[PDB]
């Protein structure tokens, strides 16, 4: 039971996994077994979603999060997001589930049967956290793997059938990307966009050419950087700036995953390009705009002149200006005038919403989509009663957007907490005071009084 | 091919449940490491074969 | 739905996604067995 | 003086709690209180 109690390891059972810090074999076991849990859930969850799936109801009325991910890659779907073939969903689910048994096998072997440390056994697989060279080398391998993953996405989009494109002219459809955006001024220009309203930083990406081109960049950057880290050792200023310890490295990764978690939350909440509304339901801004569109359509059918209709406040009941002059929907949705979506853009001219297009060119498919999106707004109760909070029971609905945003905000937040926990512990343990203050060397007793 | 397919899948299911218990028990067991190591190897090659058999028979039943 | 040939396995498929939760709960059974030492 | 290991008693007991609370959740969706 090598290190498997508090007396030996110095760590209580509830911090038991800290017993692994310097046991590279068992720690590799933990890691591989864990990757099996992730792959397991992906496969089992997909099969479950498929078993429950009624192809003619929208995905977003069915509590699906994984099928929508698969569909967006262009598997299983046709024009408008119509499901034409569930078999690809099946394949994805099965292949992950089978794969997780392999990973789970490796994990159990390393964790329980293999060498508890790897260093005696192998110098390629063994490691010391304080070995800066081995650390950047392993980091470099993983960078290359990630780079190849990003390029797989490019391969799908360009050579293996394309991606679902909500923006396809004539209507949403799978489309092969042939002219991916390579211009670094566009690709890196996204990184310098404001995260505030009407800008949206990277969340603003609104076409698949930029999406594909960015992963071309990212795949190349990751592979290059991975090579770089295999071939180099950290610079002096790097060595002086960081703590070099397993717990410190966990902490840097915790911060990064926290940040990424927050980013994903805003991505699923606002973006309707890589989270097509055909699959994920309308965004909050989209459904609110769809409501105004719905009543503009209705009342104008009844004979209202929607351009000149002054609402109770003096602002136009249907149509008003944004603070920079663009014609936008009125009522509370004035806040959502940065919204853009395929069903609405045909009505937009260089000055914003165009009154002549509004009066003459609204098609029945736009009315239908706007009514669908208004009535699938991402609002609903924790027990999945769809609607505002005062709604009566009947409609079993919570948008996949709310489930995905809320879950990722919770995760990203607790990951920030773990970052602070571990970054501050790593600092203290590196300096030697993580177990408490030395009673005979209490630093504050050697300092001058404040007053 | 259905009889064949369905047996092969129920067999995969069953062998999986057996491996799920037996691999960790074998691995943490003091005694029969020799008799176990062999069975684990056999169970595994068998598990893999069944997966490929199910995979192939899938197309003669779907 | 699953392709019809797999339908018999529907009830099993219904329960699999929860198995990860079981692994967390298993750590506690194990610790209770080793007296949380 | 023991004969049944405490870890078994806890595991069986814990599983019993999960079952009964699971049943209670099931019942939120069926019969009285289900909205249907």
């Amino acid at each position: 039971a090598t290190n498997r109690d508090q007396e030996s390891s110095g760590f209580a059972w509830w911090a038991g996994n800290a017993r692994l810090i310097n046991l590279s074999g068992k720690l590799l076991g933990a890691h591989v077994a864990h990757a099996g849990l992730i792959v397991f859930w992906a496969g089992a969850m997909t099969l479950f979603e498929l078993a429950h799936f009624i192809p003619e109801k929208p995905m977003y009325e069915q509590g699906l999060i994984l099928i929508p991910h698969i569909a967006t890659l262009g598997w299983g779907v046709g024009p408008g997001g119509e499901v034409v073939d569930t078999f690809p969903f099946f394949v994805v689910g099965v292949v992950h589930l089978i794969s997780s048994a392999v990973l789970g096998f490796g994990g159990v072997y390393h964790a329980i049967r293999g060498p508890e440390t790897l260093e005696e056994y192998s110098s390629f697989f063994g490691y010391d956290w304080k070995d800066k060279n081995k650390m950047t080398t392993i980091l470099g391998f993983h960078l290359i793997v990630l780079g190849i993953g990003a390029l797989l996405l490019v391969a799908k989009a360009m050579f293996f059938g394309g991606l679902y494109d909500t923006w396809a002219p004539g209507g949403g459809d799978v489309r092969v990307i042939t002219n991916p955006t390579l211009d670094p001024r566009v690709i890196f220009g996204y990184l310098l966009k404001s995260p505030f309203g009407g800008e949206g930083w990277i969340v603003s990406v609104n076409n698949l050419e930029d999406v594909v081109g960015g992963h071309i960049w990212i795949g190349l950057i990751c592979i290059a950087g991975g090579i770089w880290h295999i071939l180099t050792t950290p610079f002096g200023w790097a060595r002086r700036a960081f703590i070099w310890s397993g717990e410190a490295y966990l902490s840097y990764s915790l911060g990064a995953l926290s940040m990424m978690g927050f980013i994903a939350t805003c991505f699923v909440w606002f973006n309707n390009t890589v989270y097509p509304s055909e699959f994920y339901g309308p965004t909050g801004p989209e459904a609110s705009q769809a409501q105004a569109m719905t009543f503009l359509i209705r009342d104008q059918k009844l004979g209202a002149n929607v351009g000149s209709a002054q609402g109770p406040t003096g602002l136009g009941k249907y149509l008003m200006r944004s603070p920079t002059g663009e014609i936008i929907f009125g009522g509370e949705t004035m806040r959502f005038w940065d919204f853009r979506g395929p069903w609405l853009e045909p009505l937009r001219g260089p000055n914003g919403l165009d009154l002549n297009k509004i009066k003459n060119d609204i098609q029945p498919w736009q009315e239908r989509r706007a009514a669908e999106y208004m009535t699938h707004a991402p609002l609903g109760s924790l027990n999945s009663v769809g609607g505002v909070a005062t709604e009566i029971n009947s409609v079993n609905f919570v948008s996949p957007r709310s489930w995905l945003a809320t879950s990722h905000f919770v995760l990203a937040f607790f990951f920030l907490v773990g970052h602070l926990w571990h970054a501050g512990r790593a600092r203290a343990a590196a300096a030697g005071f993580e177990k408490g203050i030395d009673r005979e060397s209490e630093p504050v007793l050697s300092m001058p009084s404040l007053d | 091919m259905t009889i064949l397919f369905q047996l092969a899948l129920a067999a995969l299911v069953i062998l999986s449940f057996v491996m799920v218990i037996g691999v960790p028990v074998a691995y943490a067991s003091p005694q029969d490491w020799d008799r176990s190591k062999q069975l684990i190897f056999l169970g595994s090659g068998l598990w893999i074969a069944l997966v490929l058999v199910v995979g192939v028979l899938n197309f003669f039943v779907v | 739905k699953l392709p019809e040939a797999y339908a018999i396995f529907d009830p099993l498929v219904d329960v699999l996604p929860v198995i990860p939760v079981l692994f967390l709960a298993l750590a506690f059974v194990w610790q209770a067995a080793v007296g949380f030492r | 003086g023991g004969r049944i290991p405490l870890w078994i008693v806890a595991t069986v007991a814990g599983m019993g709690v999960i079952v009964i609370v699971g049943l209670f959740f099931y019942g939120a969706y069926a019969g009285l209180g289900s909205s249907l």
């Binding site: - | 449940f17 799920v20 960790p24 028990v25 | 009830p11 709960a25 059974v29 080793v34 | 595991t11």
Partner: peptide, 29 residues
């Protein structure tokens, strides 16, 4: 719900079964 209940029953017992077998056999827990 009998089919699903039986499945979750034997999936659920598998974990503690492993621990039990190992404990009986004085295994490396």
């Amino acid at each position: 719900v009998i089919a699903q209940l039986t499945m979750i029953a034997m999936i659920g017992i598998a974990g503690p079964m492993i621990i039990f077998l190992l404990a009986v056999r004085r295994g490396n827990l």
